[PDB]
Design an enzyme around this catalytic site. Structure first.
Site, PDB file in Angstrom:
ATOM      1  N   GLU B 295       0.804  -0.965   0.282  1.00 31.64           N
ATOM      2  CA  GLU B 295       0.026   0.156  -0.032  1.00 31.64           C
ATOM      3  C   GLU B 295       0.952   1.337  -0.094  1.00 31.64           C
ATOM      4  O   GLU B 295       1.729   1.338   0.878  1.00 31.64           O
ATOM      5  CB  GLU B 295      -0.979   0.047   1.188  1.00 31.64           C
ATOM      6  N   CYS B 329      -2.275   9.063   3.150  1.00 32.47           N
ATOM      7  CA  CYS B 329      -2.067   8.479   1.700  1.00 32.47           C
ATOM      8  C   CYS B 329      -3.408   8.919   0.739  1.00 32.47           C
ATOM      9  O   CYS B 329      -3.323   8.811  -0.527  1.00 32.47           O
ATOM     10  CB  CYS B 329      -1.849   7.059   1.580  1.00 32.47           C
ATOM     11  SG  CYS B 329      -0.139   6.487   2.369  1.00 32.47           S
TER      12      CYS B 329
END
Lengths: 533, 544
Positions: B295, B329
């Site tokens: 990720e 993010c």
């Protein structure tokens, strides 16, 4: 709602047997000129190749050609341009293409694909039936079911928002690289990603070209649009080099050797900075599969199941039994019975003689490799050939079934995948069954299939626990080959591959990259929070 | 039947409720107590291998981002010897753990979830606030709600997965065994979410794996708190080894082990690629093909159509861009606004900007967001602010100042770019820096194409519009620009079981933690067929 395709019996006078005989006659003396297909364009390069009938290598069953780097790159560009629209199609609509294809394979095209698999790959009637018909049909029907049902797997919505998962195809193209030994695997490797909204360059196996193109045409006829699957035979290294050099590669769906899969994996890694996204690699990589016998076993089942697992389709299966472990107490029975049945096996032309148990191996290179193993068996101080050992490539690539006893449980022949009709037996002392189970687990680098034959429940439970990671498809009182879609999803770990279990419900997840969409139906409040006041 | 298969159970779970922390509330008093419990304190956090607390010479400190004079934890980096010892011990514990019923493994995580929900809530919130610089509400959605939800929902998904079984036809019975992976998994977690570390190590453990967990240095305090709760909830020794370490050293060691079977990673793209390459280099040494899950970052957009609700755009954009100092993010860093709405939106953004309070989140609950995580982040953000000042294509509309004398403090900053392809529109900053590009209304389609093509990322994005046709069009156009796509809501704050999180392109492998399929990456199924009748002849009837 889908069920498995019935396996036909092909009895004398049956519709299917008459149809198959006609289809076989339809191929006698025929050579098909099979082009590369990019979109709807049939393309020829100067790199001409031939597929030969394994049991009669004078018969060129197909003439085809290798796509060059340039053609492969054009195929990539054309496929990418078709991807967005295909991916936007409702899953149900993509599924319909495969369901229609399945019906065609089941009915009007059954005899054709069976015959092309028999003549082109050297399969007998039943081996072609379980492969080119049943397994392929089941892949198409079950994957269609799994995919349509996957859309029903949706997240929780809480007012005033609604959440929805969109099962996107992967962005880019998928390279599908299929093996000679199952027509159905080619259909699945290219077809499963296409079903999930991907576009695919399919490099079919040289030695299965005839049947592979038959499947391709059926998919096109069933409504697959142009540029969703490109039919691109190619030199192996050239194909790998080209697809791993494209910024648009998003997956490789591979079935074949461990070293080739590792090479592709390393090529993708070398090129990570070029790709738009991280490519997904799926690899089904073979095995060195065992049948383990306990003294309580039913001998007749051990014998017939082992003969089938080891020798059907010349042992040319990633799942074939090649190491048999037998307790001393049962060896005289099992040895005697194996050798007696061995003498009754018919090796011959499967089109001309339905009495044939198995036929020639696939090609000259396979014949050479297998001969090296027979030569080794004649040389090694720990090996004795009990039956068979002959081979003759004058007319077809014919290798007799071979049964060998090894006195060394860790002889190279007990470890290395031969992909030929070569069974090695190791006889163990009854009182050392547990130590021998440990050896089954520790001897090879592979983890694909295995079977235990025993009628003692405690033994079965103990063996099952001990061999947990020695086989991803594990069998109790059955042979190690013949996984059926929806019943025994197929695959294993260790060196045998990535174990994505094609044939089960989760396989298609490798070919979708989900998007979650949250829609909020009321205006947002203040940016501050109450506790801040 | 010699193999007997027990019927499988089901589990009812719901999302953990978010608390309000109103004045006088028990949770607010509890949190204040927990914060006071940390004032002036330094915890010495060892490596843990099995049940042994181990110290090495490589002593490290975690600092409080808003008061870097405060060393909140002293810890140490595991050396290569300790990491390899941790691997050996984990492997020796694996078979027993893998053979334990799924339901029994799940119970550990359900117990932990309850501890976090109740008696340990204030502790993990406080440690996330003080150690990572989160405000009350950011800690609450993370160290409590998301982590608890990961534990409860993954437990449900795992127990229910065993009910997914193949068809059996006479004379045979088929069963799928959901084996853990053979080997160990390395979990490598980020500073910005406490919950992510818990999931990265916890999800593989739930599925019968053993794990070396390298937590983030800048989240050590809260991470160890979670580790201790797992052990207290009944996690056996050597299932999760707590091994902070130098990043390269850790990666070198785990990728050199024959027994590596997975890396569960959240962090930078270059580091993920590096690990991927190390695994490829070592392919011939492994017993099986390792599974890498990554990720990574984003450069996330809010796209505004002329039909948008202005107040929703302003509110959702301020939150997405500036909560936790934009250190997500998923944070919005690029805002696309049509000329027609720009006067209204600019006015509102600038007014609200002046009302944003930056300060100490422990001492002042009025704080909207606090200091950024560390000196490295502060330096990077500073360089971007300097770029904004010097670039002929950029104009600083609000904020722009920073001060690291007490904490790593950065004002929220709004920039306008006249260039839709300016570097600041492309590169992830991980700071409270929002860039705005104004487009002509009649070029919305061309601009949607730019939103899609401008960056290397595909993580989150939002469209603000009340026109249904436009929403449909944008949804289709931006299909691969965001793995988590939002219609009239902000691009941050995915909730487990509601918005499974992740995206593709450069943003990672998109395994969707938070959804029902994530756990499938951490199991390697075996299928067992038991046949109940003797086999027949080897010949087939058609051969007669």
């Amino acid at each position: 709602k889908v069920a498995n395709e019935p396996i036909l019996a092909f009895s004398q006078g049956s519709p299917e047997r008459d149809a198959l005989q006609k289809a076989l006659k339809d191929l006698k003396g025929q050579t098909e000129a099979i082009p590369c297909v990019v979109g709807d364009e049939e393309v020829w390069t100067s790199d001409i190749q031939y597929q030969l009938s394994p049991f009669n290598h004078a018969h060129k069953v197909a003439k085809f050609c290798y796509a060059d780097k340039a053609l492969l790159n054009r195929a990539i560009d054309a496929a990418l341009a078709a991807r967005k629209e295909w991916d936007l199609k409702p899953m149900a609509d993509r599924a319909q293409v495969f369901l229609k294809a399945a019906d065609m394979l089941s009915g009007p095209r059954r005899a054709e694909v069976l015959a092309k698999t028999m003549v082109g790959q050297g399969k007998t009637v039943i081996q072609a039936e379980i492969d080119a018909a049943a397994e392929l049909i089941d892949f198409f029907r079950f994957n269609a079911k799994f995919a349509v049902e996957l859309e029903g797997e949706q997240p929780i919505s809480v007012p005033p928002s609604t959440n929805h998962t969109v099962y996107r195809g992967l962005e880019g193209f998928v390279a599908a690289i299929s093996p000679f030994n199952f027509t159905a695997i080619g259909g699945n490797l290219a077809g499963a990603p296409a079903l999930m909204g991907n576009v695919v360059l399919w490099k079919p196996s040289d030695t299965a070209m005839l049947a592979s193109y038959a499947v391709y045409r059926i998919l096109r006829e069933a409504g697959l649009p142009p540029n969703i699957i490109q039919f691109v035979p190619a030199d192996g290294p050239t194909f790998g080099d080209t697809v791993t050099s494209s910024e648009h590669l998003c997956g490789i769906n591979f079935t074949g050797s461990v070293p080739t899969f590792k090479h592709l994996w390393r090529q993708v890694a070398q090129n990570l900075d070029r790709f738009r996204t991280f490519p997904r690699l799926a690899g089904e990589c073979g095995g060195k599969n065992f049948h383990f016998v306990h003294s309580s076993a039913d001998v007749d089942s051990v014998v017939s199941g082992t003969l089938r697992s080891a020798f059907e389709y010349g042992g040319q299966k990633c799942s074939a039994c090649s190491r048999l472990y037998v307790p001393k107490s049962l060896w005289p029975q099992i040895k005697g019975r194996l050798l007696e049945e061995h003498s009754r096996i018919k090796v011959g032309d499967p089109a001309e003689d339905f009495g044939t148990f198995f036929s020639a191996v696939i090609d000259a290179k396979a014949f050479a490799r297998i001969k090296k193993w027979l030569e080794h068996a004649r040389s090694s101080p720990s090996l004795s050939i009990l039956a068979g050992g002959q081979c003759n490539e004058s007319v077809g690539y014919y290798v007799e079934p071979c049964i060998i006893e090894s006195k060394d449980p860790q002889e190279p022949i007990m470890k290395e995948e031969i992909f030929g009709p070569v069974l090695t037996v190791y006889v163990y002392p009854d009182d050392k069954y547990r130590e021998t189970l440990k050896l089954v687990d520790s001897t090879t680098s592979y983890g694909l299939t295995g079977a235990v034959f025993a009628q003692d429940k405690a033994i079965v439970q103990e063996a099952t626990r001990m061999l947990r990671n020695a086989a991803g498809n594990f069998y109790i009182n059955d042979k190690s080959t013949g996984s059926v879609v929806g019943q025994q999803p197929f695959g294993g770990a260790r060196a045998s591959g990535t174990n994505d279990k094609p044939g089960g419900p989760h396989y298609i997840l490798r070919w979708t990259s989900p998007q979650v969409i949250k829609e909020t139906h009321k205006p947002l409040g203040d940016w501050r929070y109450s506790y801040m006041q």
